[PDB]
Design a protein around this ligand. Structure first.
Ligand code: ZN
Ligand code: ZN
Ligand code: ZN
Ligand code: ZN
Ligand code: ZN
Ligand code: ZN
Length: 94
């Protein structure tokens, strides 16, 4: 947990909404392509049986990463068709 309290708390207040609407495949590929998510972390997520479960795992790991990885996630949401979810996280981005 290297991310600032402000960012973490914002993500927590919207945890439920994110895990419900996102598809991890596209987001993770964008993050890896961007260089802020490892293939080892991606494999662990893909290994989950359901969409919500994969999303929950992705969120769980994001919470353990730093500020630049959180920004990558934020940027991945914006480019992968999740503007509404990103707008919720905007005020908390470092
Ligand atoms: Zn916020
Ligand atoms: Zn909020
Ligand atoms: Zn991949
Ligand atoms: Zn980093
Ligand atoms: Zn990007
Ligand atoms: Zn961009």
């Amino acid at each position: 947990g290297s991310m600032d309290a402000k960012a973490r708390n914002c993500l927590l207040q919207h945890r439920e909404a994110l895990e419900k609407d996102i598809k991890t495949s596209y987001i993770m590929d964008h993050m890896i392509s961007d260089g802020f998510l490892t293939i080892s972390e991606e494999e662990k997520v893909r290994n989950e049986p359901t969409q919500q479960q994969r999303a929950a795992m992705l969120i769980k790991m994001i919470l353990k990463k730093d500020n630049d990885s959180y920004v990558s996630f934020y940027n991945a949401l914006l480019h992968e068709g999740y503007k509404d979810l990103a707008a919720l996280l905007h005020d908390g981005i470092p």
